[PDB]
Amino acid sequence: METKEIFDAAPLSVSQFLSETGQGLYIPPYQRAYSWELPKIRRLLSDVAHGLDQLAEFEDSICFLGTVIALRDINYTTVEPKYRSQVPSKVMTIIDGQQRMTTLLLLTTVLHEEIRVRAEKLTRDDEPSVWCYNQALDVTGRLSNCFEEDMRYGEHRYYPRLIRSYYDVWSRNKGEARYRSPIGYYLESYVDLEAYRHLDRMRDQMRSMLRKAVGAGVKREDDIQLPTGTDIGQSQNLQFALFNSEFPPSVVEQLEDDAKMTPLTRLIVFANYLLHRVTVAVVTAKREDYGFDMFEALNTTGQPLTAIETFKPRAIKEEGLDEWQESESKLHFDVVEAYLDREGADKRQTVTSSVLLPFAMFQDGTKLTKRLNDQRRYLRTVFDKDPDIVARRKVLAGLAQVARFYEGPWGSPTKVPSCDDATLRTQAGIALAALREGGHDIVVGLLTRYFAAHRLSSPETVESSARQFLLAARSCAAFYALWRGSFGSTAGIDGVYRSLMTHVVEALQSYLKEQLRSEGIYDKQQWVARAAMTPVYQHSKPLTRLLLLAASQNSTP
C-alpha cells in the first residue's frame, strides 16, 4: 500500500517534540554512548544562536537542528527493562540523532538553572523586572516540561525501577536539582566511566559557555552571540515572535541601560528562541527495518551547492536575464574561474568561504561566517539593497576579492607597481608574504583596495594609488607585528580591523596608530616592554618577522 506508514515525517519545534504529554525517548540497545566533541557542541549552540540572531531582522528565518529517525514502538518490544505496568504511552526509540538529542536536553539543563538562579538574584519586586521574574518562571517551568513529567506518585516510576545511563542519570539528577525548593543555588552534577566523564563534562561546559555569554569578555574563536538588551528592545519582531506580545515599554528602557536583568533576559530570549523557533525533523517509522533502510535513504542524498552557485542564478535572473552575457556576467566569470581553479567538493566550500568572508568586510564590514545560511543571505541582502546599478558594483567586488587572492596574498607575492620607488615594492611584498601566514586575514579584506588601485582612472591618477596600496600593505603588517607581536593574542586585531572599515591612506595609518594608542600600546617604552614578554610560539611567522625586523635593520647602521 506504499502510501503506508514507511515514513511519517513531521516538523517540530524543540518543545513540541520534547514536551509532549505522554512521550518517552529511548536509546536502543545497539546505539553507543554519548561521545560528542566540544567543537561539535560549540557548532550546535552557535547555530541556534544564529537563529536567535537572524530573527531580529528577517522575521521568518528558522533554525534547524537536523532530523531524527525514530521507531514508534507500540508493544514496548524495545524497552530494555520491561516492567509493563508503567512504561510510557508513547515510546520513541531513537535510531539516528541520538547524539544531537543528548546535547539538546542538556542544553535545557544549563538554560534552566542559569535562568533559574539568575531569577533568584532577581530583585524580588521593584518595577518591570518582576516582569523578568515571570518571564523566567514561565520558561523554567516550560523546560521542566522537557526533562520529565509527573505521573502517579513515589519516585517517578513505581518504587524500584531506575535510571542509570550517562544521559539518563544526568537528567534524573537535574530533575532533582530543580525540584528541591529550599533555595535556588547553582547546581553541580556527581560500563566505562569515561562515558559519564565526557557527559558530565560536556554538560558543565554547556553551562560554562552560557555563563560565558552573560558578562563581557569577548572571544570569537568560541563564544556565541546572543543579541543583547540594548538591541533586543528595538526589534518588535523578536518581542512578538518570542513572547507573542510586545515587551512593556517600561522594560525596554531598563534593558537599554544593560541592567542586572539584561544578562538573564538574554538567556531567556535565547531559551524561547530555542524552545519555539528552532525545529527538528522527525521521521517515525513503525517497522524498524524500514527505519534502517530509511537511515540509508537519508545518508546518501546530498551533494552541495556553493553560496556563489546558489546566488549566481539571482544575478543571471536579476537585471541581466537570458540575454545576459553582459557586464555583471564578466564580474561573475572572474569568481567562477577562481573557484574552478583553486578547488575540486569540500575544497569548493572552504575556498568559496575564503572568498566570501573578506568580501564581507569589503562591502559594509559585516563579519560573514562559513554557514551556508549566512552566506546565501548576506550575498542576497547586499546585492538587493538597491537597484541595477549598485548590483553591478557588489558583484564586481566579489570578483575583485578574487583578483586579490591571485596577486598579493599567496600567488608569489611580487606584483603591486613593480617600479614606483622600487625599494617600496620590494619591501611591501614582505607584508603581503607574511600577512598570509597567521592571524592577519582581515588585513586581506582591507588591503583588497589595490582593488581601488586596479579600478582607477587610468594614467590620470594611477601611480598615486599603486603607491597607496604598497603603503597600506606595509602599515597592515606593521600594526600586525605590533598587536600580535606585542603581548596577547588575536581576536582583538580582528574586531578593530572590522570597525576601521565601518566606523569612519594617511587616514588608515592615523586610525590604526590611534587604536594602538587606545590599547595602551602607543609610546615606545611600554610596547617594547610588552613585546619582550610575548612568546613567538604564538606565530612562527611572527617570530621570524620580528627577528628579521631587528636583524635586517643593522644593514644600514
Added chain:
Amino acid sequence: METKEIFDAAPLSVSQFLSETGQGLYIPPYQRAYSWELPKIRRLLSDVAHGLDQLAEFEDSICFLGTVIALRDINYTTVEPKYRSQVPSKVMTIIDGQQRMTTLLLLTTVLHEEIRVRAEKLTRDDEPSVWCYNQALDVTGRLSNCFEEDMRYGEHRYYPRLIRSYYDVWSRNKGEARYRSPIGYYLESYVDLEAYRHLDRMRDQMRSMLRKAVGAGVKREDDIQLPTGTDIGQSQNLQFALFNSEFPPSVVEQLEDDAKMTPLTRLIVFANYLLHRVTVAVVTAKREDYGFDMFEALNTTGQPLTAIETFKPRAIKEEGLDEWQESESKLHFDVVEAYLDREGADKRQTVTSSVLLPFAMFQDGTKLTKRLNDQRRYLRTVFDKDPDIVARRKVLAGLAQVARFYEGPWGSPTKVPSCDDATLRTQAGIALAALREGGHDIVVGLLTRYFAAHRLSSPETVESSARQFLLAARSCAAFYALWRGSFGSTAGIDGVYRSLMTHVVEEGEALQSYLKEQLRSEGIYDKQQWVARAAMTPVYQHSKPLTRLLLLAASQNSTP
C-alpha cells in the same frame, strides 16, 4: 507556527510521484548537468533488482531511492522562461535528487521501448500468452504516464515553446518515438555538447544493461539479478504483489518452460516493481531557503552501524538477559575485538563484511552480499534457526572466522601445527599465504572451517588429527585454486567452492580432495588437457598465481 510549511514530507511510488496528473518536475538554474557515472546507475538498478528479488520471499521489503527535496512553486517564480499562459498546474523545482530523478525517468524510457518491441514478437493469439501482451500494454501505458502528459493541442505546449536540455530533449524525442504508429522498432536518439553525449550514452547503456538480463550470458561483475519465469510463477507473493492477482495457471506453465515470452514477462515484472513497490520520500518546501537549510539538515545526520552492531542486541537479549555476561558473550567479545582492532568508520563496515561473507559459507553456505539489509537478515535467520544451544554455535562460528582472520588469512602465514611433519607445515603455509593474494576468497570460509575444527578438537585424544587435516585442506585449496585459475577466469571456481560446502552427503578430509577433484574432472582434468589450458592462460590474470606457478615449476627442480 513552527508546525508550518517548513517540511511536509510524504512517501510515493514511482508512479505516484511521476504520473500525478498535474505535476511537471523542474530543474533550477543552479543545479549542474546530469553527470552520473555508470557505477551509480548500475547500483540504482541493482537496488531495485535486489528489491524485486527479496520480494518473492519476504512479502514486505521495499526498495528505497533516497529522498528528494523540491519546491512547490505556486507562483511560478522559478521557471526560467515564463510563458505563463500554459505553465503546468503543479511545478516542483528539484533542489536535491535531480540526478536520481533523471536516471529514473530514463529508466521508464527504456522499459517502455523494450517491453514494447519485445511484445511485438509476441504470438498475436494462441493462449494465455495474450495475457502477456495485455500485461505489456498496461505497463507501457503506465510508464508513458511517467514521461509525459496530454493537454490541449499542437506540439505539446502551444506553438513556439520548446524543450532543449539533455534530459528535456531526451524525453521529448523518446515520447515522439513511442507516439509514432508506423511500426514498433527500437529507438535510437538524435550548452557544451559533452552533456548531450553523456546523457544519450547513459540511456543506451541502461537499454544495454536490461537487454542483457534477458538472454543467457552471465556477468556478475555487472548485469542485474532478475528472477526467471521458472521461479516467478512458484511465488504467489510476487504475483499478488505486482499484479493484485495470481497469474493464470495457464501462464505459469508456459513460464516454467522459459518460453519466448519469459524475457518480456521478466522485464514487465521489473517495470511493475519499479512503478509500484520502490518508493521515494518527497519533502515539499514552499520557500526556497527552507529547502536549502533542510538539505543541510539531512546531509548532517547519519553514521552507520555494522550489521554486527544491530545483531548484538538480539544476542545479548536472547538466552542471556541482563545477567548476561555468559558463553555467547565471550563468543561475541572475540568478534568485537577483531573488528575494533583491524579497523576504526567505513573501514568498520568493510571489515565486518569481510568477516561475514565467509561465515555465511561457514554456516549453511549462503553467499552473503555486502548490503546491511541482507547481512542483518542472514544473521537473524541463522541465529534464530534453533534453540538456546545452536544459537551459541552460530555465534561461536562467527568468532572462529574472526580468529581465522588473525591466524593465517594475512597475519603471518606461519602457524598451523608448527611440528606435525614439518615439511607439510612449511608448505601449507605457502598455500595459506598464496590464497590470500587473489581470487580464492571463498576458500577462506572453507579453510576457516577446517582449522576451526582443529582449534575445537577432542584435545590430545584426537587433536593432532584435525591439526594435520588443516594443512592438508589448505594445500588442496590452493591447488584447486591454481588449477581453476589457469583455466581462464574466476567466478566459476567461486560457485563450485560454494557448492562443495552444501552439496555433500553421507550419514550424520579425503572427502574434500575427492569432491574437488571430481569437480575438476567435471570441468577438465586428465593431465594433457589441463596443461594446454595452462599455456592458454595469461598470468596477468593473477600475478599471485603467476608467481605460485613459477615457484611450482622451479622449486621442484631441487630434488630431481
Added chain:
Amino acid sequence: METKEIFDAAPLSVSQFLSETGQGLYIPPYQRAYSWELPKIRRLLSDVAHGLDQLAEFEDSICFLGTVIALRDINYTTVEPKYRSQVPSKVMTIIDGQQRMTTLLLLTTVLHEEIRVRAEKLTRDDEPSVWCYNQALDVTGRLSNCFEEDMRYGEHRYYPRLIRSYYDVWSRNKGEARYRSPIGYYLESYVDLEAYRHLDRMRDQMRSMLRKAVGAGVKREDDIQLPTGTDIGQSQNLQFALFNSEFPPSVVEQLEDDAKMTPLTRLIVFANYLLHRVTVAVVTAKREDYGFDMFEALNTTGQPLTAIETFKPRAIKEEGLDEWQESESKLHFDVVEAYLDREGADKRQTVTSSVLLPFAMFQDGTKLTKRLNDQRRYLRTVFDKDPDIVARRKVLAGLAQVARFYEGPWGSPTKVPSCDDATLRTQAGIALAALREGGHDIVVGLLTRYFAAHRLSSPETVESSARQFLLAARSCAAFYALWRGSFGSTAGIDGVYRSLMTHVVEEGEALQSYLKEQLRSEGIYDKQQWVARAAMTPVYQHSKPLTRLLLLAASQNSTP
C-alpha cells in the same frame, strides 16, 4: 489551492482535545447560552457508558460524541476583551458543538470531585488498594489537565482580567474547589441569571447521575450501566485498554468481594474510558466564513439505514449468492413486507426496533436495545453462530415475529385457532388485546415463539395441539402480568420474563405455567398475601391494567 485549509479534520480522544498544553477553547459572542436539557445529558453519559460497556467484549468499539467545528484563530480577532500579553497561543473558537463541549467539560468536573473524595475515604495503606489511591491520583491529574493550565503567576492570567460566563465561572470556581488543599470534602457551587441557574443545576445533576450508579437502588428508566467490579476484573481487554497493563491479581479479588473501593474504581474505569476511548471529531477551518459554509455542509447529508437494511447484505451474501432467489429470501420477504407497510422516516427505525427487540428474546434470550451498533452486532452474531441450515431459522424467526406483529399484539386481536373450544378463543383474544398496552411487552416475544410454533406446526399431524397451546400461553401470560403489575411496578416482571426463556432445561405449555407460578411464589403469592399487595397498589400506573381488573371482578359475577 482547494486542497488548502478549507477542512483540516482529525479524530481525537477527549484528553487529546481537552488537555493540549497550549490550547484554549473559546465560544464566540454570537453563540447562545448553554441551554442543554437533562434528557440530552442523560443520553450522552449513557452513550459513553455504552462504549465502556461494549468495550469489554469487543476489543475495538469506540464511543463517539459527534463532531465539533472550530476556527484556529491565529490573530485572536475573535477574543472579546483583548489583553494580548497573556492570551493563550492556540485559541480554538468553537463554531459548532459548543453545548456538547460544556457538558463534557462539566463531566470531567463531577468525575474529578467524586473520584477525589472517594479516594480520601480510602484506607490509606493496606493492600492492593493503594493501587486504587494511585489510579485515583492519575485520573484526577489528567482531568484537571482538562479544566485549566498553569501559565505565569498570580490568578492564572494576569491580575485584573477575569472569567465570568456561566460555563466560565463554573470552571474557575471548580478550579478553586480542587486547588484548595485543606481536606477533601464534597463541593458546593456559588445577562439573564436563569442561564447560570440551568448550568449550575445540570452540573450538580451529572454528579447526582454518577453518584447514583454507585450504590444500590436500580432504575433502567435512568442511571447508566457502569460495569461493576464483580465483572470488571474478569476482562483483560478492559484492564489493558484503560490502564495499559493487567491489574494486579492481588486486586481483582478484593474487587470480586465488591469491597469499599469498588464504586471508586468503577468511577475511575468510567473516567478513563471517557478520557481515552471516546473520541470526538474536530474540523478546524482557518477562515470563519468557511467554518459557516462547512457547518451547513455537514448539517445536510445523512439519512439512516435500519439494522435490517444493513443486515440483508450479509444474508443475501451468505449461503444465497446472487443466485439468491432462495429460502431465506422468502423468510426475509416477509419482514421486508411488514416494515415497508408499518412505516414511512424515523418511523422506520422505531418500527424495526419494535421487531428486533422481541426477536432477541426469540433466539437465546439476549435483550436488544435500540442502538444501531448493538442491533447490527446481535443480528450478525446470532446469524453467524453456525452454518446455512440454522441461519435460515434465524431469519425465519424474525419473519415469524413479524407475522405475529400482524396477527396479535396490534392487528385486530381476533385470531388464534378461530374454533378450538371457542370460549377459550374469545377469552385469549382479551389477553392479546390487553398485553399490547403497557409494560407487558416481552410477553409479546414469548407469545410470538409459541404461536410461531403453531403457525409452523406439524399441520394436521400435530397442528390443533399447537393452536391450543398458544392461547394457553396467552392467558397464562396476561395472568402472570396482572400479578406482577399489582405487585408494585414493572422492571422485575420483564427480567423474570427474560430468564424464563433462558433459564430452563429438560432434555433436548404446562412447563411455562409451572415456571411462572414458581417465580410468582419466589416473590409472593398464596392467596391472602397477593390480595394484600393488590390493595397496596395505585391504579394510575397503567389504565389498561385497571380496566382489566375491573372486568375480572365484574364479568365473573355472570356465572356466580
